[PDB]
Amino acid sequence: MKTILVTGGSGFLGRRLVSHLSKNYTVVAPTHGELDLTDREKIISEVTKINPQIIIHTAAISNTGLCEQNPELSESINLNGTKYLAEAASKINSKLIFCSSDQIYNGNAEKGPLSEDIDVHPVNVYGKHKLEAERKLQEILPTSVSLRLTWMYDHPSSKIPQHKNLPIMLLEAKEKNVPFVTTVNEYRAITFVGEVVENIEKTFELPGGVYNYGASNTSNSYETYKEIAKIMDVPENLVENDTNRFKAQARNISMNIQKIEKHGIHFSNTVDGFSKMYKSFSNSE
Amino acid sequence: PMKTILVTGGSGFLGRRLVSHLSKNYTVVAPTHGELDLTDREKIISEVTKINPQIIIHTAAISNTGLCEQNPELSESINLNGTKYLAEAASKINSKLIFCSSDQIYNGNAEKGPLSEDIDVHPVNVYGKHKLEAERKLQEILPTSVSLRLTWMYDHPSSKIPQHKNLPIMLLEAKEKNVPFVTTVNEYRAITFVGEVVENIEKTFELPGGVYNYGASNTSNSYETYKEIAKIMDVPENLVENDTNRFKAQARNISMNIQKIEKHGIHFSNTVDGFSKMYKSFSNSE
Numbered sequence: 319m320k321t322i323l324v325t326g327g328s329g330f331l332g333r334r335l336v337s338h339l340s341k342n343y344t345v346v347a348p349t350h351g352e353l354d355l356t357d358r359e360k361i362i363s364e365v366t367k368i369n370p371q372i373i374i375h376t377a378a379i380s381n382t383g384l385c386e387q388n389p390e391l392s393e394s395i396n397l398n399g400t401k402y403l404a405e406a407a408s409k410i411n412s413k414l415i416f417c418s419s420d421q422i423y424n425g426n427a428e429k430g431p432l433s434e435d436i437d438v439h440p441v442n443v444y445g446k447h448k449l450e451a452e453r454k455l456q457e458i459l460p461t462s463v464s465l466r467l468t469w470m471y472d473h474p475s476s477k478i479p480q481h482k483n484l485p486i487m488l489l490e491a492k493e494k495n496v497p498f499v500t501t502v503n504e505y506r507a508i509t510f511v512g513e514v515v516e517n518i519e520k521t522f523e524l525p526g527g528v529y530n531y532g533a534s535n536t537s538n539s540y541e542t543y544k545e546i547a548k549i550m551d552v553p554e555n556l557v558e559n560d561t562n563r564f565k566a567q568a569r570n571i572s573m574n575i576q577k578i579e580k581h582g583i584h585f586s587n588t589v590d591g592f593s594k595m596y597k598s599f600s601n602s603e
Numbered sequence: 604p605m606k607t608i609l610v611t612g613g614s615g616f617l618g619r620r621l622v623s624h625l626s627k628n629y630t631v632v633a634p635t636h637g638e639l640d641l642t643d644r645e646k647i648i649s650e651v652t653k654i655n656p657q658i659i660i661h662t663a664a665i666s667n668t669g670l671c672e673q674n675p676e677l678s679e680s681i682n683l684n685g686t687k688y689l690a691e692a693a694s695k696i697n698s699k700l701i702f703c704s705s706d707q708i709y710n711g712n713a714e715k716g717p718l719s720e721d722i723d724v725h726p727v728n729v730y731g732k733h734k735l736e737a738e739r740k741l742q743e744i745l746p747t748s749v750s751l752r753l754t755w756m757y758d759h760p761s762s763k764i765p766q767h768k769n770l771p772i773m774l775l776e777a778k779e780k781n782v783p784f785v786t787t788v789n790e791y792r793a794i795t796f797v798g799e800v801v802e803n804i805e806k807t808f809e810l811p812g813g814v815y816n817y818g819a820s821n822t823s824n825s826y827e828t829y830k831e832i833a834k835i836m837d838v839p840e841n842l843v844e845n846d847t848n849r850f851k852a853q854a855r856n857i858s859m860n861i862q863k864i865e866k867h868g869i870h871f872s873n874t875v876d877g878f879s880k881m882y883k884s885f886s887n888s889e
Contacts, residue, residue, distance in 0.1 A: 330674035383730025387615035
């Protein structure tokens with residue numbers, strides 16, 4: 319009975335991973351109050367007591383100032399946490415699955431889908447800290463797996479609660495009649511959480527390294543979201559194209575996913591991924 | 604007859620300490636996220652009109668986005684949402700809104716010394732940019748609204764009221780694990796005991812609308828200030844390392860000039876004296 323320790327059960331992906339993997343795995347999903355990650359002594363011993371075969375780390379690899387009333391805003395590397403999770407994992411040869419981000423690509427100036435071997439230099443704090451976590455998971459845990467995830471979504475009529483993501487934002491533009499702003503200077507994919515969650519068992523056997531993980535997309539955000547809005551019966555004129563955003567240089571974070579296609583892991587593209595699972599779903603509309 | 608205050612963020616660090624302070628002198632309504640959703644313009648307008656508070660203290664953070672559940676939409680747009688709607692609800696009932704801003708709006712500034720509210724600012728992080736835009740929107744919609752620029756705060760390490768790891772607790776952990784707490788001579792920041800921020804809050808209610816630097820003062824760098832705070836706490840002086848690498852291009856100066864509010868009779872202690880003052884307050888003599 320393999321034991322899966324999930325750090326980040328409270329989050330959007332964490333809470334959905336726990337529900338799916340509680341079928342055939344024992345899932346131990348503690349709260350940040352239950353399991354202070356920066357307490358090395360505690361995390362080493364608690365990891366050893368649970369003795370998990372697989373660790374899926376989704377918890378905040380540091381954070382900005384928002385979400386808190388009294389934040390420090392040191393704006394240093396603020397790593398640790400995963401470092402202690404890493405050494406605890408190495409002690410019992412655990413398989414660590416880090417939830418990374420395609421925002422690592424957001425500084426790249428190349429066009430078309432980007433591969434995992436291409437030199438990266440993100441521009442915002444989120445991309446910088448995710449990349450730094452990747453590099454350090456590698457040197458301490460060579461067998462560890464880094465999945466660069468995209469902006470994601472559940473069906474907008476889902477039972478599992480979720481904060482505002484794009485399917486909800488397009489529906490709200492329909493009700494309030496205020497248009498949702500986007501741009502042609504953005505190339506990004508959005509992946510149904512179900513495909514991310516359903517493919518997650520296949521990653522357990524992957525050799526250690528960095529893997530692009532999510533939907534593909536060759537279209538820009540403005541073209542993509544019109545296609546999605548047009549599926550949801552959302553007026554066309556409700557999705558606007560602001561040429562000012564990313565004017566200095568386009569944000570291209572569309573991933574080439576052939577590395578995981580070799581290992582039999584498939585994601586559909588962004589448009590046909592949304593449509594298939596908008597229709598498949600048992601929501602009458 | 605007794606004034607009524609609507610406090611948002613009633614569970615957070617500052618919000619919970621404001622509710623506790625005011626509950627005996629006012630009718631304080633501190634609704635949870637389930638009781639009052641800040642992303643909903645329709646709902647905000649409906650509740651504030653019914654509660655009809657004379658004073659609204661907005662301390663809550665925008666915790667209702669995808670960033671806070673680690674599924675972020677990382678646009679430059681930094682949408683206000685909740686803070687903008689609160690202002691509109693207040694305009695219609697004529698409520699005096701008090702907003703929790705931040706001194707981090709000064710972190711881009713290149714000037715030296717304590718900075719006043721009337722200078723040209725340009726923050727370089729996301730916290731400063733969201734907070735400054737919140738002020739800009741509030742002074743447009745609510746001329747009477749008051750925006751208090753707070754500092755990084757701290758309660759006592761041994762107070763039974765919870766908090767996240769702030770300065771005084773990190774220096775104790777340094778002593779425990781013999782890990783040097785790293786700081787820098789390139790940072791000019793003040794920190795304030797929350798008790799001084801909270802017992803002066805009643806004075807701000809009368810203040811004319813505008814921006815007011817609201818917190819402790821500091822005339823020296825973080826390294827020297829954290830060394831002083833170390834020696835008072837009886838933690839060893841070797842555990843305060845100054846990493847001069849941090850803030851190489853432009854030193855972070857968020858020292859605040861509180862000269863505006865002290866003309867209105869609002870006095871704050873400085874960083875060092877204020878700490879010893881509360882540190883001596885705790886545990887009364889037998």
